[PDB]
Amino acid sequence: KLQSTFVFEEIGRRLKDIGPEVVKKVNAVFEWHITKGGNIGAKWTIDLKSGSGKVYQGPAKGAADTTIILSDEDFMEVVLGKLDPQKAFFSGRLKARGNIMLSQKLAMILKDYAKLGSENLYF
Ligand SMILES: COCCOCCOCCOc1ccc(C(C)(C)CC(C)(C)C)cc1
Ligand SMILES: COCCOCCOCCOc1ccc(C(C)(C)CC(C)(C)C)cc1
Ligand SMILES: [Cu+2]
């Protein structure tokens, strides 16, 4: 019953327009625990430490630099721009473990699509 799955799947293709530039600026692994009810429904890893990046189901193959835990609905609230991640973090709806600062980066980076998309041009 998970809507985030669409977002994570679509992310794998976005990294073809954006991957190599994100990896250069982030250089870290991110694990995501999506919860339905109060139970984990899906786990996702966004590896941004090599190449254009990787997104795969399940816990981080290696050790993850940061892990984020939030409900499936709230995850949609965030990716749609309605729920600021820090507001969710301090209200308790979003939980973050590891290097929080690196997730706040992944956030700034991906909100500026123009810089990294053009820098990903070969021409
Ligand atoms: C707004 O700048 C990004 C330009 O590309 C967006 C095209 O997609 C339509 C907008 O809907 C989306 C799609 C994907 C996303 C995610 C969550 C995958 C973030 C992204 C596109 C930066 C990887 C957010 C909104
Ligand atoms: C010290 O800061 C205190 C508040 O901490 C907030 C921690 O942030 C949690 C994660 O922040 C995010 C939120 C969304 C995202 C995106 C939208 C880029 C994730 C995505 C593209 C995988 C949907 C990245 C990082
Ligand atoms: Cu922001």
Author numbering: 5 to 127
Question: What did the published study say regarding this structure?
Answer:
The Kamer and Jarvis groups have extensively studied the human steroid carrier protein (SCP-2L),23 a single-domain 13.5 kDa protein containing a hydrophobic tunnel, as a scaffold for ArM design. The steroid carrier protein type 2 like (SCP-2L) domain of the human multifunctional enzyme 2 (MFE-2) has previously been used as a protein scaffold for both regioselective and enantioselective reactions using covalent modification through the introduction of unique cysteine residues. Here two methods for site-selective incorporation of bipyridine into the SCP-2L scaffold were compared, and the copper-catalysed 1,4-addition of indole to enones was used to analyse ArM activity. Crystals of SCP_Q111CBpy and SCP_Q111BpyAla were soaked in solutions of Cu(ii) ions and their structures determined by X-ray crystallography.
The structure of Cu(ii)-bound SCP_Q111BpyAla was determined to 2.51 Å resolution and revealed a different orientation of the bipyridine moiety compared to that seen in the Cu(ii)-bound SCP_Q111CBpy structure. Despite the lower resolution, the electron density for the BpyAla bipyridine rings, α-helix 5 and the additional C-terminal amino acids (120–128) was very clear, indicative of a more rigid conformation for these parts of the protein. The co-planar BpyAla bipyridine rings are wedged into a shallow pocket formed by the turn between G85 and P89 at the edge of the apolar tunnel. This conformation is stabilised by van der Waals interactions between C1 of BpyAla and both G85 Hα (3.35 Å) and D88 Hα (3.36 Å), C2 of BpyAla and Hδ of P89 (2.87 Å: 3.36 Å to the Cδ) and C3 of BpyAla and Hγ of P89 (2.74 Å: 3.26 Å to the Cγ). In addition, the side-chains of D88 and K115 (one turn down on α-helix 5) lie on either face of the bipyridine and may stabilise the BpyAla conformation by aromatic–π electrostatic interactions. The B-factors for the Bpy moiety and the Cu(ii) ion (43 Å2 and 57.91 Å2, respectively) were lower in this structure compared to the bipyridine rings in the Cu(ii)-bound Q111CBipy structure, indicating that the catalytic environment is more rigid. Among the novel ArMs, SCP_Q111BpyAla displayed the greatest enantioselectivity with an e.r. of 20 : 80 (±1), favouring the S enantiomer, and a yield of 42% (entry 9). Overall, the substrates' activation in FC alkylation mechanism with SCP_Q111BpyAla favours the formation of proS product over proR while with SCP_Q111CBpy favours proR product formation over proS. The crystal structure obtained of SCP-Q111BpyAla_Cu is a rare example of a protein structure containing an unnatural amino acid.
